[PDB]
């Protein structure tokens, strides 16, 4: 007598009128003229926006910083809209459309002569941000397949998650910090400038606590 | 075989340096001293 179990009911869930992902334009509506600096610190460190779920239950989590151009948005859109069931699923964008202009000089020119012309636009992404959020009358095992397929093609380390796995991921890291048997931590040493270590560190390392190196995130670091 | 482009310990592509066991112990020995310095500077 194989023991059967109840099944979750999604009857209480509603589906919007346009479940599929809307189209993202290459450049913003009005083209920008003022050229901007590189400002690389927009992909450095943890994210302070779009770190929590709003409507859906499954998403693609960013495990590193990077820039998204139009080519990335089309890959996410087509791959998801093709592999998902419009009736029982829906998806939304958790990242704005490309707005940061990227200049580029013409081929064959030497250093100098001013600044280059705007070539394309990107969207900066920090680690810990949700890129795409999905939901509906579906379990995670259904979407986890093609969401990871998308996550592998992104320019940064990404991974599909759910409200549960994300919560568990965070609680497991807190458990590691508490049960760590090592009496020496990056935070304690840096904040107290032990060994004069702040001569080889950065001011951001006071807040990142060794979990970040440039745009790369290290989850095994406590 | 085994060329490091340019100079060994500078630039983009450097010769990798690995942490030995005594280098770890040497650093930990220093930490234990300065941790006890914080205690006597507290009264």
């Amino acid at each position: 007598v194989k023991t059967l179990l109840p099944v979750p009911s999604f009857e209480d869930v509603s589906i919007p009128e346009k479940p599929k992902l809307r189209f993202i334009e290459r450049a913003p509506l009005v083209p920008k003229v003022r050229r901007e600096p590189k400002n690389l610190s927009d992909i450095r460190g943890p994210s302070t926006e779009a770190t929590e779920f709003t409507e859906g239950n499954f998403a693609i989590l960013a495990l590193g910083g990077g820039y998204l151009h139009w080519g990335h948005f089309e890959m996410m859109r087509l791959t998801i809209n093709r592999s998902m069931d419009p009736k029982n699923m829906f998806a939304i964008w958790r990242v704005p459309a490309p707005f940061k202009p990227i200049t580029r000089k013409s081929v064959g020119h030497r250093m100098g002569g001013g600044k280059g012309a705007i070539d394309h636009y990107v969207t900066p992404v920090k680690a810990g941000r949700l890129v795409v959020e999905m939901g509906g009358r579906c379990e995670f095992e259904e979407v986890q397949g093609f969401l990871d397929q998308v996550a592998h093609k992104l320019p940064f380390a990404a991974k599909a998650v759910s409200r549960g796995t994300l919560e568990k991921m965070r609680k497991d890291q807190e458990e590691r910090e508490r049960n760590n048997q090592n009496p020496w931590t990056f935070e304690r040493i840096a904040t107290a400038n032990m060994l004069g270590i702040r001569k080889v560190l950065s001011p951001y390392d006071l807040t990142h606590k060794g979990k970040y190196w440039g745009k790369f995130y290290m989850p095994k670091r406590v | 075989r085994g060329r490091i482009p340019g100079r060994q310990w500078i630039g983009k592509h450097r010769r990798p340096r690995f942490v030995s066991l005594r280098a770890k112990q040497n650093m930990i020995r220093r930490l234990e001293i300065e941790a006890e310095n914080h205690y006597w500077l507290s009264m």
Binding site: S41, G65, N182, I197, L201, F216, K220 | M27
Partner: peptide
């Protein structure tokens, strides 16, 4: 030299590399 954010993982100062090795879970 190299910027603080790089497409490639940037090699650390040896003092920092030792710090990361002592402060391991």
């Amino acid at each position: 030299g190299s910027k603080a954010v790089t497409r490639h993982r940037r090699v650390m100062h040896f003092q920092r590399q030792k710090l990361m090795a002592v402060t391991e879970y």
